Amino acid sequence: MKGLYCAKKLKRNRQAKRRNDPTYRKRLLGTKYKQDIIGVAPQAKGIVLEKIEVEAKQPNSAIRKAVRVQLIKNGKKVSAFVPYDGAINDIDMNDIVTLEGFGKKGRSKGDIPGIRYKVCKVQNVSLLALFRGKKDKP
Amino acid sequence: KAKTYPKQKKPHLKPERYYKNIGMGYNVPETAINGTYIDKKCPFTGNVTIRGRIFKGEVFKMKQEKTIVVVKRYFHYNKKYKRYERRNTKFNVHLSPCFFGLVRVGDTVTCGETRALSKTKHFAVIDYKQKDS
Amino acid sequence: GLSRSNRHKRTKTGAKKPIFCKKRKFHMARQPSNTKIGEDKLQELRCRGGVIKKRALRLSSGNFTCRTHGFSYKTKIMQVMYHPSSNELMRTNTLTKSAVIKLDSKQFKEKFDSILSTDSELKNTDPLFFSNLDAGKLYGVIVSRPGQCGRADGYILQGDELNFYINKF
Amino acid sequence: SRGTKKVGIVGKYGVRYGSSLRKRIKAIEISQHAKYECKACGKTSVKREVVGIWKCKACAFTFAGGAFAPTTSAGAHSNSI
RNA sequence: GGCAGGCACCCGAGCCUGUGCAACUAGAUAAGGUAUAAGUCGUAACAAGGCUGCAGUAGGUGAACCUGCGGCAGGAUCACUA
RNA sequence: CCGGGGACGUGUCCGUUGAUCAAGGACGAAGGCCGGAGGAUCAAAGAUGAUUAGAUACCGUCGUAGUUCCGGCAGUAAACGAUGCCGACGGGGCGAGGCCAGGGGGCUGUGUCCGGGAGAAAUUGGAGUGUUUGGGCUCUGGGGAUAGUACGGUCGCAAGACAGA
RNA sequence: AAACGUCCGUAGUCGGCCCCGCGCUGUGAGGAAACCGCGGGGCCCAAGGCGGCGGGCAGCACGGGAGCGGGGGCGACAG
RNA sequence: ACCAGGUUGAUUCUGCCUGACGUGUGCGCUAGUCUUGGGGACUUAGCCAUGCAAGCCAGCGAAGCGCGGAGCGGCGGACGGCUCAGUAGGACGGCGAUAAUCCACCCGCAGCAGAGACAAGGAUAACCGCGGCAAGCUGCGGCUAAGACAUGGACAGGCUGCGGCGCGGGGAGGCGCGGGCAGCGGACAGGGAGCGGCUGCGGCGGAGUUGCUGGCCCAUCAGCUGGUAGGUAGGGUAAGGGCCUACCUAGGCGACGACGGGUGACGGGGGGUGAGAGCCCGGAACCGGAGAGGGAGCCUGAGAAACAGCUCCCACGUCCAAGGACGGCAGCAGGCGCGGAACUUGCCCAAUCCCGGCGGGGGAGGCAGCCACAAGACGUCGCACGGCAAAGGAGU
RNA sequence: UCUCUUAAGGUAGCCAAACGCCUCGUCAUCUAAUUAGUGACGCGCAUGAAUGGAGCAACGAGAUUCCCACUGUCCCUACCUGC
RNA sequence: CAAGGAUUGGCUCCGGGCGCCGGAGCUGUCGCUUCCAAGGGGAAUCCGACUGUUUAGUAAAAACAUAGCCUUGCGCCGCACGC
RNA sequence: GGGCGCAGGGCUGGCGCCGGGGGCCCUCCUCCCCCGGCGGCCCGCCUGCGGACUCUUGCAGCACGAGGCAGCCCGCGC
RNA sequence: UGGGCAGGGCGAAGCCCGCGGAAACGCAGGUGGAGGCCCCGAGCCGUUCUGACGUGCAAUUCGAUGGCGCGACCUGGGCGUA
Ligand SMILES: [Mg+2]
Ligand SMILES: [Mg+2]
Ligand SMILES: [Mg+2]
Ligand SMILES: [Mg+2]
Ligand SMILES: [Mg+2]
Ligand SMILES: [Mg+2]
Ligand SMILES: [Mg+2]
Ligand SMILES: [Mg+2]
Ligand SMILES: [Mg+2]
Ligand SMILES: [Mg+2]
Ligand SMILES: [Mg+2]
Ligand SMILES: [Mg+2]
Ligand SMILES: [Mg+2]
Ligand SMILES: [Mg+2]
Ligand SMILES: [Mg+2]
Ligand SMILES: [Mg+2]
Ligand SMILES: [Mg+2]
Ligand SMILES: [Mg+2]
Ligand SMILES: [Mg+2]
Ligand SMILES: [Mg+2]
Ligand SMILES: [Mg+2]
Ligand SMILES: [Mg+2]
Ligand SMILES: [Mg+2]
Ligand SMILES: [Mg+2]
Ligand SMILES: [Mg+2]
Ligand SMILES: [Mg+2]
Ligand SMILES: [Zn+2]
């Protein structure tokens, strides 16, 4: 396919090659639409269902304070990890919290397994405001 | 035979048969001048004019008596790959009876943009060159 | 109403086209004014651009010429003898273009015998046309388009054009 | 206008008798009904008349052969000697 | 009943029925995969891994797997009427 | 017996007829399947005698399918040189091929050894002539696992195969 | 991680030597401003404003010494 | 025109992950000044209270007390604005075609019927009364205008058929014009503020069709096509055409990817990012298209298949005295809902321009306000002045 | 894993089946409601491999359930005709 | 004949390849296989493969038969593809 | 032997036209009822000449002799 | 040894032609007329009505409905088997 009149064959062939590229594979499939949690739109906001006990991947031995959250726009039940030490007591049941990704392109961050999203705001006020006491939860 | 009495245009200015010169530096075939056919769609002895693009293509199909399929093969350049592509489009071209027997499959035929003669016919055969020549 | 677009048609390759926009008045067609014989009734239409198009609904006579001698009269239309596109249009006596019709022979035979008085050779040149004239049969074609012009003008059939058509009806 | 894609001559049996039985009898019904070349006149005109008797309909050359073929493997071997 | 109404044609929403295509979802049950704190049973592979291994195919076994046949060395042999 | 094959040799002929391939077609070990024939050995399954903590295995004995042939299916292998085909060029040595020549010769196969170059290295006459990157053509790969799995399709009597997330 | 078990094979793509048309290419036309590139330009500076100059198009016209066709001649460590 | 960390006991690789940089969307924390720009595109082309957004006039000129301004008549409302659902070619872009077509304003030309002609006929609204009706809306009577609607009157243009030579133009002709015979048909009975009507030719301004060509993904979409491809003829149209119909041919497209599907696809001018080849984006200023809750049909008009026009259906919503009456903010603010995600129910025609024959109107548009959303520059409180439609800010 | 015992201990399959006593089994589906039907489940009183097992394409005046349509089957009868 | 849909009379014509076929128009109180004749259909389960057979007179079946598959005996037979 | 079909077909019917015989009719209607061996050719086989074509609704046929021409045979048929 | 048994429907091989193909062959249209094929007539039978009848028409019939209907059939005669 390297002849001077092979351009339509090369476009036909290299596109079929490009379908095996994993970065192009997600845009071709539309996986950001198949999960409407964080792909197409950032900052998913949903209702907390229960506090989750999840243990870190070994060799690290700790317990991350995750929460199940049902989204408002979807109804999808996704688990989300609470940062900022002691914040799990500042969030309660039937709160409406906003969730963000980890900066890992949809995978788990560090020792946590399975948890692909993390909370930033609870009842439309941030956890950085509550970890230091800057604002107040209504 | 024919649904209407076969009739041609009144020749303004063989003075008993109507035939016009289509212009653009072309010639009327002598089969059109000395002929008895009454095709109204013919560029020379009929009610169409030649205006617009005149391209040269090769006859692909001579089926379906008055129309022919003319393929114009061209190259399109893909700027990314820096190679060409062989492309083509087929045209339903009106073949006047003045070219009957003269034009056969394979001949290089120059076609001129007419009116919209049929649904898919916008070109008419104005001249031709044999493949063997 | 009826349209003129090909937005409902298939493509050259046979592919079906998607129909999305609402119909435009740019490409609107109308009913066939199936013009018949009767006392003259023409319909006026403010068509595109305000210009008044007159289509004939009923139509009694037509301005018919004799091309050999250059004289004309408006003889009355009697019936359609032949229509090329469909014989349904001659059964209903529908006046369109190129319809062979039977004309009134009286007004035409008066000038035809008058020129036959001076030139005796005229009758022998086409015997078939003058055969039907003494029987009273005179035929012509409409050359105007009565749905567009509103008239039924044409010429008298003579010569080989006549024997072409009398074989067709 | 083939009519059948796979069964051919055993399409007369319809859906009956089982696929393997129709598949088994297909090779024999092709064999017992076919015209064969006469080895006395040369023409492809040998037809079975009854089980075991094969006759050329052109030159009337009739010969005793197999049940559904003019020749069997045991019958060919005895004649090739 | 000439501002009504009627008739035929034409455009035709909308509804109903049947169906094609596209995409989604409930489901007793049941099979995988992955992750679990690693528990029980072994030890198939890695050494000739203790029966050389592997893949194919076929059958069988709680389970890794075992066996038959033909390959292969990625073998434990580059090596013997020279 | 019938058929085939390449190499060599040649003032024989043709004169570009070619290279490579989606589709398509044919062949395709073993095991398997179908119908028929046959059945000595060996031997899945099965049965035993042992071994063992256990032993459904390894060992001993027996034994069916099978192994065999004929007609067909199937269409898979570590089907390997784990190395696509065609083409140009490129160091010596040793060999046991075939044809030719007779002047440690030429063609064409085939191994081997040492170098060159390449390579992450093992190695390697191509895996060389590649950042000094371009001979043509086809195919494939794009971190691991999920998984050569599922769905849909095609093929198959079935086993399953192809393809393939 | 990855040469399909083999061979045939059509489209496709590629293809020996000698001896007017088309590809390719140069200039030019025509092509909106915004934009962009450049150039000025003491808006106090700057981003700017404002004014110059350019580009865009395998469409069109003209030109082009080479390349390809057509047709003969070789007969390729091509077949 | 760059790499760095990460598989190992250590090594060399392959390999991916991650860091490092730009961009835009959102969040978070924080915040002194000024200029400039942007801001419900993404989900919901979801639902909308209230107000406003397209009106104007010079013909005729009533009431009302010559002034006057109603209604008739006319022009516009088909432009702007908003939005991006549909659309994979009905688009768009480039190059054409319209010898296949239509036309308002405006501009330049030619012209506009002797008819009793120092002259034009019947009306209707306004209005004067009488009413119906919850409201929306509407009736009866009486009079009365015209640049409204007629009458009068045909030299031409025009239409159609037939005839037909030339002269001009054009690449190409009965295209223009002159010369013919018929059948039709057809341009001023206006005024004491500038004129205004109408017919034709040529523009301009538009518009409809249209040719070639280029532009996403999927082959786990391989064959597709029946008005389909063509012919003849008619119809229909402003106009070529299977556009439609009648009859007749068997065609048409496809691995140079048809057909079918997908798209959280308007296209483009362009934007982002890279040394470049490329990759990605284009809702968003300008241009083109399309739409106005889903539809379909239409009236008027030069121009709409119009929606701040109509008619109906559907889905939502409202008022009723229960007979009926209405609503379409993808115009401007504003509300709700949606979501991650987006401002004041501010002032004004002053600027930019548009409609109207001028005084008018314009949520187009500007000004200000809100917002660290962005670009740029610069630090760590009250007069007078100044500008502004007005106010505020800049500047003394 | 151990142990008793048999000629061998029911394999592949299949099932409250025309084969399940308990039993109207349990779960699902079907219905307003189902001892029925179907799909599952299987320590199956007492399923099971030519005493043939599994299997339903085609076929059936076979046995059964549901749906559509249909109806004097019924609500709930009435009238007419012949005999 | 899966399911499911449309059409169907009379008259007057036209066309064709003319025992017939196609088309058009007109027409009736919408009606046309006008009487007669003449399938109800779908989703499933059980059993038997099928066509066939049977208890003349209570059972037509799932029973029987069947082909296929298999086993047995027989070289004194109708001669092993046989009985 | 059986069977679909092709061709023929004892005969039967219809229509048209003609011909007897009988009966019925407000109008209409030509109503109603009954009756009407022999020679040549054709098949097809075979023969002669000759030498390669030739069907059938259908498979096909044909140098072991096609079509054609001229005969012959025996039936169906006219 | 004789005889009997409408009319339709579906359309198997084979064949002809067209189209496609490098080839193998594949589609399409006719042709052909297979099959214990389909609906059914005469006829045969006996599913249901658990109809009629049930001291009957009848010591098994009648009617409707249904099944079969070129067969693994039915049937006259002759013959065999007690
Ligand atoms: Mg081992
Ligand atoms: Mg083998
Ligand atoms: Mg084997
Ligand atoms: Mg065998
Ligand atoms: Mg042994
Ligand atoms: Mg599958
Ligand atoms: Mg590998
Ligand atoms: Mg009034
Ligand atoms: Mg009045
Ligand atoms: Mg969209
Ligand atoms: Mg845009
Ligand atoms: Mg079991
Ligand atoms: Mg139950
Ligand atoms: Mg029930
Ligand atoms: Mg057994
Ligand atoms: Mg049993
Ligand atoms: Mg039966
Ligand atoms: Mg039906
Ligand atoms: Mg069914
Ligand atoms: Mg049965
Ligand atoms: Mg009984
Ligand atoms: Mg069996
Ligand atoms: Mg002969
Ligand atoms: Mg039968
Ligand atoms: Mg029956
Ligand atoms: Mg019986
Ligand atoms: Zn023979």
CB contact under 8 A, C84 and B120: no
Please give the single-letter amino acid code of residue B90: K
CA of B69 to the centre of ligand 5 (A): 78
d(CA B36, CA D77): 78
The tokens for C54 are 């007159």
Q: Tell me the pairing of strands C71-82 and D36-37.
A: unpaired
CA distance B69 to chain C (A): 12
Alpha helices in A5-85 (DSSP H): 7-18, 22-29, 31-34
Contact predicate A118/A100, CB 8 Å: yes
**DSSP conformation letters of A73-117:** TT--EEEEE--STTGGGTS-TT-EEEEEE-SSSSS--TT--S--E
Contact predicate B43/B96, CB 8 Å: yes
Q: List chain E nucleotides near protein: any atom < 7 Å from a Cβ.
A: 9-11, 35-38
Nucleotide nearest to D5 (CA to C1'): L26
Q: What SS3 class is residue C48?
A: helix
CA of B31 to the centre of ligand 16 (A): 94
Method by which the model was determined: cryo-EM
Distance set, CA D13 to CA B130, D3, D29 (Å): 59, 14, 12
CA of D23 to the centre of ligand 3 (A): 22
> Residue A106, exposed/middle/buried by CB under 10 A (0-12, 13-18, 19+)?
middle
Q: What is the DSSP letter of A118?
A: E
- Reference D68, options D39, D40, D36; nearest CA is D36
Q: Tell me the pairing of strands A44-55 and A63-71.
A: antiparallel
Interatomic separation, CA of residue B18 and C1' of nucleotide H394, rounded (Å)? 83
Q: List chain L nucleotides near protein: any atom < 7 Å from a Cβ.
A: 11-16, 26-32, 34-37
Cβ neighbours of residue C132 closer than 8 Å, sequence gap 6 or more: C138, C139, C166
Contact predicate D26/D11, CB 8 Å: no
Element (H, E) at D50: strand D44-50
- Based on its alpha-carbon atoms, the radius of gyration of chain D, rounded to whole angstroms, reads 15
Phi-psi region of A2 (alpha: psi -120 to 50; beta: other; left: phi over 0): alpha
CA distance B132 to chain A (A): 27
Q: Is B120 on the interface with C (CB under 8 A)?
A: yes
Contact predicate C101/C95, CB 8 Å: yes
A80, A83, A89, A92 alpha-carbon torsion, rounded to 10°: -30
Cβ neighbours of residue A122 closer than 8 Å, sequence gap 6 or more: A90, A91, A95, A96, A97, A98, A130, A137
CB contact under 8 A, C165 and B120: no
Q: What is the DSSP letter of D73?
A: H
